[model samples]
Target: SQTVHFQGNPVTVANSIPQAGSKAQTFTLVAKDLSDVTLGQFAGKRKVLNIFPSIDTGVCAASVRKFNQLATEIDNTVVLCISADLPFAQSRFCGAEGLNNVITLSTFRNAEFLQAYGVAIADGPLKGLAARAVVVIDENDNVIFSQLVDEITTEPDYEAALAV
Candidate 1:
């Protein structure tokens, strides 16, 4: 189990974040088109999982935009902006913001995802949603870097994730 703060108050997180150097855990998330997208689909490409609670929030939106621009800097890498929002809402936000560099994925169908990545918000008002975290997987399916932000309202370490 892991714990994070939301507005300075502690909130419980389920499982544990994928540690660096471990084999990447496979996941199946819903794409904006309502299609199932699995980790295997991106075989041989680096994956940057920008996981969060929801796209409707300010902090999560900011992280999506930041990763959107940063995506172009990394070669053969795909930035996956993940949240528990519905596909409709996820697409609407990206479409409105003109954020094309990152691929938005929804956890609407995958309750198992939160535990696999250690991102599930087990308590607080945001219960059942994902915690703000970043998991970077290498081309070989290795977890190169990962961070479960201590504060749910804050962003992950983009520089450290990109550096790996």
Candidate 2:
């Protein structure tokens, strides 16, 4: 397990973020429409995975909207917003916000996803939810950028990830 600071205290995190230059493996996650999704589905394409806990919270919501804004400027890649929220809730938030470029995905159905992404909150009020992070993969399936937001409440370095 990894450690991170949340509200000026240390908390346990389940997994470590994939390091840059590591090969990204395909992960099965539930899309907003309740369909299964995997990296293979978008083979030969780039990705900007905007992972967080839930869209209901202000931090998560702001990340999603920010990624949506970055979407237009980013071409030929998908901005996948991942969380533990149910597909219904994910859809409701994205729809209400009119976020088209950000593809909302949920991991409520699987326990493995948290470890898969290395973003699990091990012991906390938000246990079982994913920690905030961003991973950018190139078309070759290589991680070009990754950021595990050390302070859970703070936003990720969007500018740095996108610059990759």
Candidate 3:
């Protein structure tokens, strides 16, 4: 488990975020197109899992756009924007912004994904939703980078996640 300070108060995450050299656990999530996508779907390709609470918020929306921009330039990498929002909502937002590079995934069907990634907000006002985080997985499903944003409202470290 990892401890993060939220508003200067320490909060412990139930599940530790995958660290460098750790194997990423396989999970399934609903894609914007209403299709079920699993970790195996991207086998042999590097993946950037961009997790957030809701796309309705400014910070989450911005992260999606930022990842979309980075996606075009990153070689053999897939940028997956994940949230608890419904698939319709996720698709609508990305479609409106013309962000085709990043794939939007929702936890509507599989709420367990938040737990699997160790990002479930446990006991906060935002409980049941995923906290802001980023997990980078290599081609072989090993975690290369993981960041559980200390502040729920802040944006993630885009440069570090993308290694830009």
Candidate 4:
């Protein structure tokens, strides 16, 4: 576990941050088209998990746009923007501008993602949360890359990742 912040005050981030060369944990996140997706289903190609805190700001949205273009651009790779995001709001900024779930009206998966990666904000103001970051996995499901966004506001080293 670790801590990151919004305005210097900190929030604890779970360590489900999959390290490089390890098996990536399976996760379920809704796509821009409002369908359920999973790590297992995303197999047979390299994957870019562009996870973040939300899809509301220029920072997060731009990051998503950037990856959307880049994900398909990179050979045999797909970009996955995970904010858990707002599904209703995106029904334009972002589920069309909002985005949740172990299971949902949206799914039939197994396992709660927050804890699958590790224990997240279970209580307090930040309850039910995780830090912003990125992960890349090979078709074999081995995590080939990882990075924890230091500022939690800046986009990841997209260049370095895509180049990998």
- Number of the top candidate by lDDT? 1
TM-scores for every candidate against the unseen true structure? 0.90, 0.88, 0.84, 0.72
**Inter-residue clash pairs, candidate 3:** none
lDDT of 3 by residue, 123-160 (tens): 64676788878888888888988889897666777664
Residue 18, candidate 3: C-alpha displacement in angstroms: 1.0
Displacement of residue 108 (Cα, Å) in model 3 is 1.7
Ranking by TM-score: 1, 2, 3, 4
Prediction 1 TM-score vs. true = 0.90
After superposition, candidate 1 runs with Cα above 4 Å error = 58-63, 94-101
> Which candidate wins on TM-score?
1
Displacement of the residue 105 alpha carbon in candidate 4, Å: 13
Q: lDDT: which is higher, 1 or 2?
A: 1
Question: Whole-model Cα lDDT per candidate?
Answer: 0.81, 0.76, 0.75, 0.57
How does model 3 fare in lDDT? 0.75
Better of 2 and 3 by TM-score: 2
TM-score of 4: 0.72
Clashing pairs in 2: none
Q: Which stretches of model 2 miss by more than 4 angstroms? A: 58-64, 94-99
The residue-by-residue lDDT of candidate 2 on 1-164, one tens digit each, is: 78887797888988677888999977999987788888888777678887777776533455456655775466677778788988887765642266445678888887687897788899878788988788888888998888888898777876743644
